[PDB]
Scaffold this active site. Structure first.
Site, PDB file in Angstrom:
ATOM      1  N   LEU A  19       1.060  -1.223  -0.085  1.00  0.00           N
ATOM      2  CA  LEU A  19      -0.104  -0.045   0.060  1.00  0.00           C
ATOM      3  C   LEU A  19       0.894   1.326  -0.080  1.00  0.00           C
ATOM      4  O   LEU A  19       0.668   1.954  -0.564  1.00  0.00           O
ATOM      5  CB  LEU A  19      -1.143   0.056   1.118  1.00  0.00           C
ATOM      6  CG  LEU A  19      -2.150  -0.918   1.204  1.00  0.00           C
ATOM      7  CD1 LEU A  19      -3.048  -1.051   2.481  1.00  0.00           C
ATOM      8  CD2 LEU A  19      -3.072  -0.369   0.174  1.00  0.00           C
ATOM      9  N   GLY A  20       1.562   1.395   1.010  1.00  0.00           N
ATOM     10  CA  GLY A  20       2.372   2.294   1.166  1.00  0.00           C
ATOM     11  C   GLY A  20       3.452   2.348   2.461  1.00  0.00           C
ATOM     12  O   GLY A  20       3.303   1.288   3.116  1.00  0.00           O
ATOM     13  N   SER A  23       5.818   3.439   9.533  1.00  0.00           N
ATOM     14  CA  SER A  23       6.806   3.772  10.490  1.00  0.00           C
ATOM     15  C   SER A  23       7.894   2.682  10.664  1.00  0.00           C
ATOM     16  O   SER A  23       9.257   3.068  10.401  1.00  0.00           O
ATOM     17  CB  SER A  23       6.594   4.354  12.034  1.00  0.00           C
ATOM     18  OG  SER A  23       5.693   3.257  12.573  1.00  0.00           O
ATOM     19  N   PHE A  24       7.647   1.638  10.907  1.00  0.00           N
ATOM     20  CA  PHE A  24       8.716   0.443  10.998  1.00  0.00           C
ATOM     21  C   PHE A  24       8.867  -0.328   9.724  1.00  0.00           C
ATOM     22  O   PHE A  24       9.656  -1.050   9.900  1.00  0.00           O
ATOM     23  CB  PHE A  24       8.392  -0.559  12.175  1.00  0.00           C
ATOM     24  CG  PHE A  24       8.371   0.019  13.429  1.00  0.00           C
ATOM     25  CD1 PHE A  24       9.335  -0.116  14.182  1.00  0.00           C
ATOM     26  CD2 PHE A  24       7.318   0.791  14.157  1.00  0.00           C
ATOM     27  CE1 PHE A  24       9.504   0.413  15.415  1.00  0.00           C
ATOM     28  CE2 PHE A  24       7.484   1.336  15.379  1.00  0.00           C
ATOM     29  CZ  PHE A  24       8.599   1.033  16.056  1.00  0.00           C
ATOM     30  N   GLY A  25       8.076  -0.059   8.674  1.00  0.00           N
ATOM     31  CA  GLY A  25       8.367  -0.727   7.460  1.00  0.00           C
ATOM     32  C   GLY A  25       6.939  -0.541   6.437  1.00  0.00           C
ATOM     33  O   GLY A  25       6.133   0.278   6.618  1.00  0.00           O
ATOM     34  N   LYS A  47       0.679  -4.270   8.471  1.00  0.00           N
ATOM     35  CA  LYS A  47       1.983  -3.436   8.779  1.00  0.00           C
ATOM     36  C   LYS A  47       2.858  -4.547   9.155  1.00  0.00           C
ATOM     37  O   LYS A  47       2.787  -5.488   9.589  1.00  0.00           O
ATOM     38  CB  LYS A  47       1.661  -2.873  10.058  1.00  0.00           C
ATOM     39  CG  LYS A  47       0.693  -1.693  10.218  1.00  0.00           C
ATOM     40  CD  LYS A  47       1.039  -0.604  11.377  1.00  0.00           C
ATOM     41  CE  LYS A  47       0.814  -0.940  12.660  1.00  0.00           C
ATOM     42  NZ  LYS A  47       0.999   0.264  13.557  1.00  0.00           N
ATOM     43  N   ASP A 149      -0.885  14.909  17.765  1.00  0.00           N
ATOM     44  CA  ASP A 149      -0.358  14.935  16.198  1.00  0.00           C
ATOM     45  C   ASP A 149      -1.584  14.746  15.440  1.00  0.00           C
ATOM     46  O   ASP A 149      -1.326  14.253  14.060  1.00  0.00           O
ATOM     47  CB  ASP A 149       0.732  13.992  16.100  1.00  0.00           C
ATOM     48  CG  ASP A 149       1.525  14.448  14.853  1.00  0.00           C
ATOM     49  OD1 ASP A 149       1.562  15.519  14.292  1.00  0.00           O
ATOM     50  OD2 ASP A 149       2.308  13.380  14.503  1.00  0.00           O
ATOM     51  N   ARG A 153      -2.231  14.185   7.801  1.00  0.00           N
ATOM     52  CA  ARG A 153      -1.389  13.092   7.371  1.00  0.00           C
ATOM     53  C   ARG A 153      -1.621  12.025   8.421  1.00  0.00           C
ATOM     54  O   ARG A 153      -1.488  10.805   8.025  1.00  0.00           O
ATOM     55  CB  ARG A 153       0.264  13.564   7.263  1.00  0.00           C
ATOM     56  CG  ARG A 153       0.594  14.019   8.797  1.00  0.00           C
ATOM     57  CD  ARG A 153       1.896  14.567   8.858  1.00  0.00           C
ATOM     58  NE  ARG A 153       2.301  15.268  10.286  1.00  0.00           N
ATOM     59  CZ  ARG A 153       1.838  16.294  10.497  1.00  0.00           C
ATOM     60  NH1 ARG A 153       1.467  17.192   9.522  1.00  0.00           N
ATOM     61  NH2 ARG A 153       1.781  16.875  11.814  1.00  0.00           N
ATOM     62  N   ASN A 154      -2.401  12.133   9.449  1.00  0.00           N
ATOM     63  CA  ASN A 154      -2.410  11.342  10.494  1.00  0.00           C
ATOM     64  C   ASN A 154      -3.841  10.692  10.702  1.00  0.00           C
ATOM     65  O   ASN A 154      -4.372  10.083  11.470  1.00  0.00           O
ATOM     66  CB  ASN A 154      -1.996  11.664  11.952  1.00  0.00           C
ATOM     67  CG  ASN A 154      -0.439  11.765  11.830  1.00  0.00           C
ATOM     68  OD1 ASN A 154       0.213  11.121  11.277  1.00  0.00           O
ATOM     69  ND2 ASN A 154       0.010  12.742  12.525  1.00  0.00           N
ATOM     70  N   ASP A 167      -3.635   5.459  12.095  1.00  0.00           N
ATOM     71  CA  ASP A 167      -2.924   4.841  13.004  1.00  0.00           C
ATOM     72  C   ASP A 167      -1.966   5.712  13.630  1.00  0.00           C
ATOM     73  O   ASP A 167      -1.494   6.725  13.017  1.00  0.00           O
ATOM     74  CB  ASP A 167      -2.157   3.585  12.186  1.00  0.00           C
ATOM     75  CG  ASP A 167      -1.256   2.683  12.891  1.00  0.00           C
ATOM     76  OD1 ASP A 167      -1.745   2.215  14.073  1.00  0.00           O
ATOM     77  OD2 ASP A 167      -0.386   2.235  12.383  1.00  0.00           O
TER      78      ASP A 167
HETATM   79  O1  LIG Z   1      -0.178   3.232   7.089  1.00  0.00           O
HETATM   80  C1  LIG Z   1      -0.251   4.256   6.749  1.00  0.00           C
HETATM   81  N1  LIG Z   1       0.299   4.643   5.464  1.00  0.00           N
HETATM   82  C2  LIG Z   1       0.698   3.541   4.429  1.00  0.00           C
HETATM   83  C3  LIG Z   1      -0.583   3.530   3.531  1.00  0.00           C
HETATM   84  N2  LIG Z   1      -1.475   2.966   4.179  1.00  0.00           N
HETATM   85  C4  LIG Z   1      -2.801   2.434   3.555  1.00  0.00           C
HETATM   86  N3  LIG Z   1      -3.906   1.901   3.920  1.00  0.00           N
HETATM   87  C5  LIG Z   1      -3.778   1.677   5.125  1.00  0.00           C
HETATM   88  C6  LIG Z   1      -3.073   1.612   6.373  1.00  0.00           C
HETATM   89  C7  LIG Z   1      -3.611   1.026   7.256  1.00  0.00           C
HETATM   90  C8  LIG Z   1      -2.983   0.779   8.856  1.00  0.00           C
HETATM   91  C9  LIG Z   1      -1.890   0.921   9.143  1.00  0.00           C
HETATM   92  C10 LIG Z   1      -2.289  -0.547   9.051  1.00  0.00           C
HETATM   93  N4  LIG Z   1      -4.969   0.774   6.942  1.00  0.00           N
HETATM   94  N5  LIG Z   1      -5.155   1.055   5.461  1.00  0.00           N
HETATM   95  C11 LIG Z   1      -2.578   3.096   1.981  1.00  0.00           C
HETATM   96  C12 LIG Z   1      -3.514   3.217   0.912  1.00  0.00           C
HETATM   97  C13 LIG Z   1      -2.911   3.539  -0.223  1.00  0.00           C
HETATM   98  C14 LIG Z   1      -1.695   4.143   0.303  1.00  0.00           C
HETATM   99  N6  LIG Z   1      -1.601   3.703   1.600  1.00  0.00           N
HETATM  100  N7  LIG Z   1      -0.239   3.960   2.346  1.00  0.00           N
HETATM  101  C15 LIG Z   1      -0.777   5.363   7.631  1.00  0.00           C
HETATM  102  C16 LIG Z   1      -0.797   6.826   7.179  1.00  0.00           C
HETATM  103  C17 LIG Z   1      -1.442   7.636   7.952  1.00  0.00           C
HETATM  104  C18 LIG Z   1      -1.989   7.046   9.455  1.00  0.00           C
HETATM  105  F1  LIG Z   1      -2.375   8.061  10.345  1.00  0.00           F
HETATM  106  N8  LIG Z   1      -2.055   6.065   9.796  1.00  0.00           N
HETATM  107  C19 LIG Z   1      -1.591   4.870   8.787  1.00  0.00           C
END
Ligand SMILES: O=C(NCc1nc(Nc2cc(C3CC3)n[nH]2)c2cccn2n1)c1ccc(F)nc1
Length: 297
Positions: A19-20, A23-25, A47, A149, A153-154, A167
């Site tokens: 996905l993207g 913090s840890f990976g 994660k 925070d 972005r959060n 998260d």
């Molecule tokens: O995880 C984050 N960013 C990476 C990311 N995550 C996506 N989707 C997603 C992550 C989660 C939970 C962490 C497991 N659920 N759905 C996603 C969908 C498309 C691109 N991305 N990029 C993140 C960012 C801000 C914030 F506040 N909390 C978490």
């Protein structure tokens, strides 16, 4: 790390596309069995920690994730499970397909080619986002937490466009320029009292909420653009405020202004914010929100 009721057997998890970065990976999407009641296949986010990380780091990744265990709100991203027995170390959470709110808002800016483009979000779409964010925040405050925070972005965006409190502690290295070391402070989102005394309460979270609305109204422009980090500290502590974004409905700017009262006691509470816009919320809000729940006093 002590294995919990949140432990999910590795064999119950399937990981597909990335996905993207977190913090840890890297964060992946995939499917899980038995994490949402008895559902055999639920779409989840997964994660991870980089494989070349120490035992200490893996445990820190797991401990941080555990703060999420206490929450269960429609407007806060849900923790679904943990894979701590063996490697790779995993954390299973609710899937938010549209990414963080800052990336989502930035993706709505016109591209600069000659092709057609969606007009910027309507006031009603902006209010719906404001309400869902305020509801997640009112939920956190009722559970005695200070977020510290709150920023686009959060926050995370679901497939159906529902915005939720994301998260915790995941964007410090994704949006480096949103943080200032001289620890790491999100200065452009901080209340004058937090910049002065290093103290954070629900009222400073309210200040940051006003900044989140300004981000929604500008499509995540950098707050106080043209000012350096040190200039931001000075300007805000002296009672300086963000400008009304071009085309921002006055109704929306007024809410930002209430959030930016210099005295924290004069700021509305998250419950007070929701109450002021509840009539504008989609009808399903009355069925899913913390605001309308039995938990809200
Ligand atoms: O995880 C984050 N960013 C990476 C990311 N995550 C996506 N989707 C997603 C992550 C989660 C939970 C962490 C497991 N659920 N759905 C996603 C969908 C498309 C691109 N991305 N990029 C993140 C960012 C801000 C914030 F506040 N909390 C978490």
């Amino acid at each position: 790390y002590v294995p919990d009721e949140w432990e999910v057997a590795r064999e119950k998890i399937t990981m597909s596309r990335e996905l993207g970065q977190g913090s840890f990976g890297m964060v992946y999407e995939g499917v899980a069995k038995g994490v949402v009641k008895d559902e055999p296949e639920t779409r989840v986010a997964i994660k991870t920690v980089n494989e070349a990380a120490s035992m200490r780091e893996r445990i820190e990744f797991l401990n941080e994730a555990s703060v999420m265990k206490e929450f269960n709100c429609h407007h806060v991203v849900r923790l679904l499970g943990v894979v701590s027995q063996g490697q790779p170390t995993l954390v299973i959470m609710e899937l938010m397909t549209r990414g963080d709110l800052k990336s989502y808002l930035r993706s709505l800016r016109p591209e600069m080619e000659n092709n057609p483009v969606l007009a910027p979000p309507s006031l009603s779409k902006m209010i719906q986002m404001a309400g869902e964010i305020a509801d997640g925040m009112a939920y956190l405050n009722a559970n005695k937490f200070v977020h510290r925070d709150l920023a686009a972005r959060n926050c995370m965006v679901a497939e159906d466009f529902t915005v939720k409190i994301g998260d915790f502690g995941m964007t410090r290295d994704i949006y480096e320029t949103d943080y200032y070391r001289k620890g790491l402070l999100p200065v452009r989102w901080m209340s004058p009292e937090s910049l002065k005394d290093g103290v954070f309460t629900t009222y400073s979270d309210v200040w940051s909420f006003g900044v989140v609305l300004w981000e929604i109204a500008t499509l995540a422009e950098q707050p106080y653009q043209g000012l350096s980090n040190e200039q931001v500290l000075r300007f805000v502590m002296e009672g300086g405020l963000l400008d009304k974004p071009d085309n921002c409905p006055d109704m929306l700017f007024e809410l930002m202004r209430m959030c930016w009262q210099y005295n924290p006691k004069m700021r509305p509470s998250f419950l007070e914010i929701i109450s002021s816009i509840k009539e504008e919320m989609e009808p399903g809000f009355r069925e899913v929100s913390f605001y309308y729940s039995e938990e809200n006093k």
